Design a protein around this nucleic acid. Structure first.
Length: 248
DNA sequence: CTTATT
DNA sequence: AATAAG
């Protein structure tokens, strides 16, 4: 089965990802920026209990670590933790937006290739390390009242809510899949941040391409959702479109 | 929570 | 003078 033949490539069986070929990212600040420390709005127990197991899992995974930082932004309950990084985003230097819009990305899909595989990468941003010099930027407060703990945590990986994460991830994955594209000149590969479409001429070519892509992704440290994977179908859902008969 | 948008 | 999103 696809599941058993490529255990390293699936989030379900391969463990948390880590993009091993990618240098830890340094996040340049705007030229006049200085740290901003926003106090954490008091959180109810209901929200804190809701968020706690998520925080513990991230600590166990090393994705969060304790820190002391002049930066601080508030964590909100939505329960899963959502950090309001807007004041950090304002202070970070802008980068060019290189992720194509889906309409333009799909223009690169030729009628000749109608056998599709769609993969989405799980916890994509978390596969990219953040350089220790940039980790303090993303700090937030975590208190555990009945565990006698109050201090800051921060991210050791590219965080959700950071304005440049989608663009930085898309650029990193492009670097990592550059060779794959060269090795498979007759496959079409569309990348939209963590959403991938592989297109080929025949069911067989799509099977061989998909095997090659899973092997490569797993090797590089990325993880795809086996649950959501659409493999070698003549009809797939990609970026909200229904891809069918070369239409849409 | 704060905050940019008839 | 409700809404979506971080």
């Amino acid at each position: 089965t696809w599941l058993s033949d490529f255990p390293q490539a699936w989030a379900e069986t391969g463990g948390m990802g880590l993009a091993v070929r990618q240098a830890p990212l340094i996040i340049p600040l705007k030229a006049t920026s200085t740290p901003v420390s926003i106090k954490q709005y008091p959180m109810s127990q209901e929200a804190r209990l809701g968020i706690k197991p998520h925080i513990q899992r991230l600590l166990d995974q090393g994705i969060l670590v304790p820190c002391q930082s002049p930066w601080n932004t508030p964590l909100l309950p939505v329960y899963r933790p959502v950090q309001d990084l807007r004041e950090v985003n304002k202070r970070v230097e802008d980068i060019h937006p290189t992720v194509p819009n889906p309409y333009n990305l799909l223009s690169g899909l030729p009628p000749s290739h109608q056998w599709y595989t769609v993969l989405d990468l799980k916890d994509a941003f978390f596969c990219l390390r953040l350089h220790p010099t940039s980790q303090p930027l993303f700090a937030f407060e975590w208190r555990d009242p009945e565990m006698g703990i109050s201090g800051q945590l921060t991210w050791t990986r590219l965080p959700q809510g950071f304005k440049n994460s989608p663009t930085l991830f898309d650029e990193a994955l492009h670097r990592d899949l550059a060779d794959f594209r060269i090795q498979h000149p007759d496959l079409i590969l569309l990348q939209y941040v963590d959403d991938l479409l592989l297109a080929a001429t025949s069911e067989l070519d799509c099977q061989q391409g998909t095997r090659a892509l899973l092997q490569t992704l797993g090797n590089l440290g990325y993880r795809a959702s086996a649950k959501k994977a659409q493999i070698c179908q003549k009809q797939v859902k990609y970026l909200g479109y229904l891809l069918k008969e070369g239409q849409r």
